[PDB]
Amino acid sequence: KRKQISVRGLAGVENVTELKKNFNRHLHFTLVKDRNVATPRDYYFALAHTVRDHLVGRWIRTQQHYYEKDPKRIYYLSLEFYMGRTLQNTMVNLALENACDEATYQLGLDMEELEEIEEDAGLGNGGLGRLAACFLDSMATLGLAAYGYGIRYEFGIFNQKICGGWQMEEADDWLRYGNPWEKARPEFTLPVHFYGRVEHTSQGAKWVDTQVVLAMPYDTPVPGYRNNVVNTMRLWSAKAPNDNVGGYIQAVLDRNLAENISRVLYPNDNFFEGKELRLKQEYFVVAATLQDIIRRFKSSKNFDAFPDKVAIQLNDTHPSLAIPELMRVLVDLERLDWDKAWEVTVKTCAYTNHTVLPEALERWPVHLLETLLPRHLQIIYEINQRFLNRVAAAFPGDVDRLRRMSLVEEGAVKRINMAHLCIAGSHAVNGVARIHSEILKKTIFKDFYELEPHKFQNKTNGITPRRWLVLCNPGLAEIIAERIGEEYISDLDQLRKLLSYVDDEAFIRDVAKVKQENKLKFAAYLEREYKVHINPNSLFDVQVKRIHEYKRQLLNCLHVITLYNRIKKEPNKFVVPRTVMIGGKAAPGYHMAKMIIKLITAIGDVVNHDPVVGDRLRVIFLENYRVSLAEKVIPAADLSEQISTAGTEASGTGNMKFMLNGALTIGTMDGANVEMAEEAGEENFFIFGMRVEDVDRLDQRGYNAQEYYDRIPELRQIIEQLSSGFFSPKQPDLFKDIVNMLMHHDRFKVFADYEEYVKCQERVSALYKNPREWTRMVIRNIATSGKFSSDRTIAQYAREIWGVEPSRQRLP
Numbered sequence: 001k002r003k004q005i006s007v008r009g010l011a012g013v014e015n016v017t018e019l020k021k022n023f024n025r026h027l028h029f030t031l032v033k034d035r036n037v038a039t040p041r042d043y044y045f046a047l048a049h050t051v052r053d054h055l056v057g058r059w060i061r062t063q064q065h066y067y068e069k070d071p072k073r074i075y076y077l078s079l080e081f082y083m084g085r086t087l088q089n090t091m092v093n094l095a096l097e098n099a100c101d102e103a104t105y106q107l108g109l110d111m112e113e114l115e116e117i118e119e120d121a122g123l124g125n126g127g128l129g130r131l132a133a134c135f136l137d138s139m140a141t142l143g144l145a146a147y148g149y150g151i152r153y154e155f156g157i158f159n160q161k162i163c164g165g166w167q168m169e170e171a172d173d174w175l176r177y178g179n180p181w182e183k184a185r186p187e188f189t190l191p192v193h194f195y196g197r198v199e200h201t202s203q204g205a206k207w208v209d210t211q212v213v214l215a216m217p218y219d220t221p222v223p224g225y226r227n228n229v230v231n232t233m234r235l236w237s238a239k240a241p242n243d244n245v246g247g248y249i250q251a252v253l254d255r256n257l258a259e260n261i262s263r264v265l266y267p268n269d270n271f272f273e274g275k276e277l278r279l280k281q282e283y284f285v286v287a288a289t290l291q292d293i294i295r296r297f298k299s300s301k302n303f304d305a306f307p308d309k310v311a312i313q314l315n316d317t318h319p320s321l322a323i324p325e326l327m328r329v330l331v332d333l334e335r336l337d338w339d340k341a342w343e344v345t346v347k348t349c350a351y352t353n354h355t356v357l358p359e360a361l362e363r364w365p366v367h368l369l370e371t372l373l374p375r376h377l378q379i380i381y382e383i384n385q386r387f388l389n390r391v392a393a394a395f396p397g398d399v400d401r402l403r404r405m406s407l408v409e410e411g412a413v414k415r416i417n418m419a420h421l422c423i424a425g426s427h428a429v430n431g432v433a434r435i436h437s438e439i440l441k442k443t444i445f446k447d448f449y450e451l452e453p454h455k456f457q458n459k460t461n462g463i464t465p466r467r468w469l470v471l472c473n474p475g476l477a478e479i480i481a482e483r484i485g486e487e488y489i490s491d492l493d494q495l496r497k498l499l500s501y502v503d504d505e506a507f508i509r510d511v512a513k514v515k516q517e518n519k520l521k522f523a524a525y526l527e528r529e530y531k532v533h534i535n536p537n538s539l540f541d542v543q544v545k546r547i548h549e550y551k552r553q554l555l556n557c558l559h560v561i562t563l564y565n566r567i568k569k570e571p572n573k574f575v576v577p578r579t580v581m582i583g584g585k586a587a588p589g590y591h592m593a594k595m596i597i598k599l600i601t602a603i604g605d606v607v608n609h610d611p612v613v614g615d616r617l618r619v620i621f622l623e624n625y626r627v628s629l630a631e632k633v634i635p636a637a638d639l640s641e642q643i644s645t646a647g648t649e650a651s652g653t654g655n656m657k658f659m660l661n662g663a664l665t666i667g668t669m670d671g672a673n674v675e676m677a678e679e680a681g682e683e684n685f686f687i688f689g690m691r692v693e694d695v696d697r698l699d700q701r702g703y704n705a706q707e708y709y710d711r712i713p714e715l716r717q718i719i720e721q722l723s724s725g726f727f728s729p730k731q732p733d734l735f736k737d738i739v740n741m742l743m744h745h746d747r748f749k750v751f752a753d754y755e756e757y758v759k760c761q762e763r764v765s766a767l768y769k770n771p772r773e774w775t776r777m778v779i780r781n782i783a784t785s786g787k788f789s790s791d792r793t794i795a796q797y798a799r800e801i802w803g804v805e806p807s808r809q810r811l812p
């Protein structure tokens with residue numbers, strides 16, 4: 001069955017023979033193992049090396065091709081690359097999946113069992129990091145000379161353990177058994193400088209007396225979809241510089257301090273912590289990367305041509321130091337005059353904003369910058385003076401606008417606003433969904449928009465249909481290919497052809513069949529890995545994303561308790577059985593998010609053990625939500641929970657994954673949800689709740705949660721259950737902080753959307769009772785998910801910002 005899937009390619013007889021041969025070669029020469037001692041892990045690694053060999057020729061040829069053609073080079077700078085696993089992706093993109101599947105089968109091995117051995121490269125927190133990963137895939141698929149640049153964290157996002165119903169954090173030791181995908185490049189190691197002081201002298205400024213940390217690059221291949229393109233992700237690793245008993249020994253041990261720079265990912269989602277170590281990581285990436293950029297530019301054939309040959313894309317403000325660093329290099333080292341260097345810098349750099357919440361913005365204390373990067377602070381100040389001079393010329397006498405626009409923020413602690421730096425130093429600034437990009441121009445960066453309107457753009461997010469359809473849901477990819485062929489895989493708009501099958505009995509049957517297959521497989525996963533049983537004949541109601549108050553997992557909690565309370569009130573009344581699944585990691589220092597996880601498990605402790613409820617309702621917390629788990633649960637989902645307060649989710653991308661994979665969406669008019677509903681037709685989406693206009697109206701008069709409590713008996717009941725200790729009998733006051741926040745300090749207006757949410761959820765159950773109509777609406781969703789391919793997104797970046805033309809053209 002497995003092998004009959006045509007989108008997975010051909011199992012050529014000579015290819016299968018060669019693969020088996022090389023599998024065995026690696027087991028022997030690479031792993032130094034025999035079939036007598038060899039474990040499943042050994043067999044995974046033998047396959048990984050075998051598959052990896054197939055990238056090499058294309059990888060060398062692609063990079064040679066870019067040297068010869070000399071196209072404009074795109075440098076995508078990010079502190080996060082949420083790559084997930086690599087084995088299946090490589091096989092898919094090289095058309096090797098069926099061949100390896102046959103090869104391993106003939107050797108007596110189940111390739112899917114082998115795939116489960118691979119650790120995620122979890123070098124990101126969530127959506128922003130995953131966007132970077134989808135972007136790398138799409139840029140390679142679109143034949144762009146693009147280079148992902150970041151940091152090789154020794155430890156990615158922490159592994160989440162649930163113990164006693166609480167999140168526990170453990171180190172994500174992803175490199176324990178090695179990483180067969182990366183190629184260490186110690187020969188290309190570069191120096192990065194910290195601290196020191198500035199000397200203004202004969203030639204000008206000089207950054208001296210610095211402490212050096214070496215940046216060692218590790219290069220990872222990024223294969224395009226069956227176009228023979230293999231691009232590169234370069235990730236820098238921190239290495240101590242080359243040059244008494246206790247004294248000598250301690251000096252050697254103290255090398256760890258420098259090397260700590262690339263030790264661990266800061267696990268924050270939509271929140272800025274001004275840690276010096278984070279600032280070092282950010283500069284580490286920027287300094288080493290820009291050295292590569294300058295050197296490669298010089299090896300291509302005076303800096304007037306720089307922006308024609310270089311694009312630097314800033315993934316949020318995290319690599320914003322690229323702006324003053326480029327100025328520093330061009331002025332201090334290359335000896336260009338300020339004006340020309342600045343012209344070059346702005347044309348080279350572009351900035352992507354992912355944020356709404358004020359506390360998410362990077363605002364570094366000037367004292368920290370003065371100490372760590374004294375020359376960069378000097379340059380920032382000069383940038384600010386000339387930029388504010390431009391504001392003053394454009395808007396004479398508008399003093400508050402000057403204050404609002406300044407890169408320098410006054411207060412008890414004087415800070416540099418890095419978003420302001422990015423806008424000033426970039427020729428393009430984009431948000432990540434239409435609603436978000438509009439609000440950047442409307443309110444958040446209104447004054448910047450008024451000064452330079454041409455700067456502001458939209459680039460609605462997307463996801464790769466390779467990982468997010470072909471890999472994770474081959475069954476759905478196949479039934480689609482059976483009707484419309486395979487072109488849609490890198491031309492997702494072709495999914496619109498599926499609207500011709502809304503009344504096709506065979507397709508309706510097959511869409512529902514695939515979903516049920518995915519649900520059985522996920523149920524099997526939970527039983528195998530956690531001994532957790534879920535009802536396969538229940539609606540799979542899924543909210544998976546990082547735990548944050550704005551994403552309103554708490555609103556989901558209120559609904560779950562509503563369903564429970566309604567069953568208890570009328571036990572004889574039929575309800576559509578549900579398995580409510582919530583998963584996601586909380587930032588270790590975010591108390592409320594940690595309490596919310598505990599509430600989910602505590603709700604489950606009551607609901608899942610009430611005999612009156614039985615298998616009619618179950619609430620489970622999915623442990624350790626990560627890219628590999630997303631690939632499992634999303635194809636199994638019936639209902640996608642996308643319930644952020646309107647105006648808070650910049651775009652979302654998990655929403656797109658669900659839409660592509662045959663789940664229907666319950667959601668607010670927020671982020672990309674708006675455009676998803678536009679594409680499919682609002683009649684095909686479960687839209688509920690306040691619009692942004694309604695939220696703003698509430699803000700204008702003041703949000704009083706008490707009013708909702710007083711007017712809604714069912715909500716009142718739930719709050720009193722939480723307060724009295726119904727969900728924490730051994731510790732009655734456990735959830736007092738949650739109750740207090742909801743009643744008095746709720747920034748995200750949970751109570752305000754409660755009634756519409758519950759009513760909307762009733763309509764979900766009503767449609768689910770009609771399998772034919774559920775499935776027909778699903779078809780209308782899958783068929784219109786095309787816009788949300790990251791190929792579309794990247795094509796827009798290329799044409800509208802980078803000035804390069806994408807190409808699906810194959811290499812020899």
Ligand SMILES: O=C(Nc1ccccn1)C(=O)N[C@@H]1O[C@H](CO)[C@@H](O)[C@H](O)[C@H]1O
Binds near residue numbers: 125268354650
């Ligand atoms: O801002 C983010 N992380 C962050 C912030 C500060 C410090 C560290 N990390 C983030 O993940 N933003 C997300 O970017 C996604 C891709 O565009 C959007 O789809 C999603 O709406 C948005 O919340």
